[PDB]
Structures are given as structure tokens and as C-alpha cells.
Design a protein around this ligand. Structure first.
Ligand SMILES: C[C@H](CC(=O)O)NCC(=O)O
Ligand SMILES: C[C@H](CC(=O)O)NCC(=O)O
Lengths: 165, 161
């Protein structure tokens, strides 16, 4: 009885346009419906910036979060799922995506190393708050976690700003 | 205060950067002092994973931190500057660099978006401790020639010692 959306493959490819061809890590994303959640699968067959370390690096946790978060937002804007984004169209999203979606704060905590080859993740929008000072942006709080098929596990938080809204 | 500052060790730096891809070498200079601390300059002429967003991204803060941190450890090993690492040689460092130097926790706070084309940073090792691996608490910050400001902390684990 909770509404869910399977991976919207067309939207996903378009969300991932700004990322390089060899950097498309987000493979699937089921979005559950006013503060939405994404449940995702990831794969990094080789790193984009460094020789193989043997584990999912902090850097990659962050790249993957960005992908998952952009997808969650885009899909939420498309299906009207996210409180605070009622006025947005998908066109607004493509315009804002790169210059106007900012990370104010990022944290990652590794409990145990994760396998970068195949891993799962999830995130939640915990609050979205609009600000329009006399003379203008959304403030958002999110949490995520990652795990794999063995015992890998990482969790964290990110505070976002959506400016020029 | 008094201890001598080590200018950028260019040969060590280039070697520390070998595992990074050719377009992802952002750390351009790094002065090391005991207090161990590194004071660094960085340049990202273009991003390695995404089209230009116009500001230094959280991802890049993290890449640059890793480069700075690896160089500070390597240089500290070479020069005997970090307690906990007294027994290490550079050859130990090269063996551990990728598989055995882990981030346990990373945080960044972006006060003011930073210019990715030219910016500065610093970090410090606050504590190193054996635990039943080596556990290190570190803090860093970045700034630029305008009003850019990012800061954070990273907890590291050095394993298989
Ligand atoms: C020391 C770091 C660990 C990590 O980022 O999680 N690996 C090297 C790199 O990812 O740049
Ligand atoms: C939403 C982020 C902002 C950032 O990482 O700081 N830009 C997209 C990216 O860097 O993947």
C-alpha cells in the first residue's frame, strides 16, 4: 500500500548525462513515496581517478550518492513526490542540476569495507525547507547507507542547497 | 615553530601521485612541518567524472584530501615526522598506499563555494594510536584567493602494519 516506482530507465540515462561514460555507477533505483526514498544498486568495474584500491573509496561513496540523489530528485519532480518541490518541472531540474544543486555538508562512515564491484544503497530526504529572505533556496537534510552481499557497510549524511529555485 | 619546513619534495610527490590517473593529479605543492602538517596548493582544470559544475565539488574535496594525506604520510615517513610510523620505510609506504590505508570516517563542510581552478589547503595529523592497526584523527581545510572555504575531518586506519 506504499506507492513505489521501478527504475525509470529513460530518466536515469538522462540524469546521468553529465557524468562521464566510464562513470555511470548507479544501475537501478526504486523510488518509494511527503519525503521520498530511493533503493539502489551500484557497480564500479574500475575507478575513474585512481588505480584499484580493492575497496569502495570514500570518493566513490560520494559520487554514488550524487547520482542516487539526482535520480531521486528528478523522479520525485517527475511524479510529484517530494515535499518542497511542488513548483518544479523536469525542465527546471535539468537547468539547476549542475550549477544550482550544492552539497553544504557531506559525511561518510565506513563500518566495514565495501565491495566496489557490486553493492547496494539507499537514501532518504528527511527534510526540505524553503528560504526566501527579503531581497532564495531550498535547504535539505538527507541520509544514506551502502552495503554489499557480504558484510560491507557505510553510512552517512548530506545537507544540500537548491539555489535559484 | 622553530622546526624547519620541508619544501615540496617533487620526486616524492610525483611518485605518490602515480596511482592517480594522468588528468587527476590536483596536488601541486605541499610544504611539510612538524607541530605533522602539510600546507598545499591544488588545481583542477577540469573534473574527472562529471561536466563542470562551476565550484569545487565534495567529491573533489575528498580526492584532494587523499592526495594531500598520502603525500604528508610519505614525506613524514621519509623524514621521521610522525610517531606511530617510526618503523616504516618508503618501501613499506608504497606497498600499503592503496590497499592498507583506509578512511574510516570523512566529513566536509562547505562554507563558501571554492574555486576549483586554483585553491589552497592544509591538514594536520592530530593523533595517531595503535588499536587492537594505526588509528589517526586528522583535520583539513581549503580556501581560495577569494572567499572560498571548506573544512572537515577524516579518521584513517593504517592496516597490515
Ligand atoms: C586513501 C583512500 C581511501 C578512501 O578514499 O576511502 N583511497 C585512495 C583514494 O581513494 O584516493
Ligand atoms: C551535487 C554535486 C555537488 C558536490 O559534489 O559538491 N555536484 C554533482 C557531482 O559532483 O557529482
Amino acid at each position: 500500500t506504499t506507492a513505489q516506482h521501478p527504475t525509470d530507465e529513460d530518466l536515469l540515462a538522462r540524469v546521468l548525462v553529465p557524468y562521464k561514460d566510464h562513470c555511470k555507477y548507479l544501475r537501478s533505483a526504486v523510488v518509494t513515496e511527503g519525503r521520498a526514498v530511493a533503493r539502489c544498486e551500484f557497480a564500479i568495474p574500475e575507478s575513474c581517478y585512481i588505480d584499484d584500491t580493492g575497496h569502495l573509496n570514500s570518493v566513490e561513496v560520494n559520487i554514488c550518492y550524487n547520482q542516487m540523489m539526482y535520480y531521486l530528485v528528478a523522479k520525485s519532480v517527475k511524479e510529484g513526490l517530494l515535499a518542497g518541490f511542488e513548483s518544479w518541472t523536469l525542465d527546471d531540474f535539468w537547468k539547476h542540476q549542475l550549477p544550482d544543486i550544492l552539497i553544504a555538508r557531506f559525511a561518510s562512515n565506513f563500518r566495514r569495507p565495501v565491495n566496489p564491484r557490486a553493492f547496494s544503497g539507499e537514501m532518504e530526504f528527511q527534510s526540505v525547507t524553503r528560504r526566501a529572505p527579503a531581497g532564495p533556496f531550498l535547504h535539505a537534510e538527507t541520509a544514506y547507507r551502502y552495503w554489499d552481499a557480504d558484510s560491507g557497510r557505510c553510512d552517512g549524511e548530506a545537507v544540500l542547497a537548491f539555489v535559484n529555485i
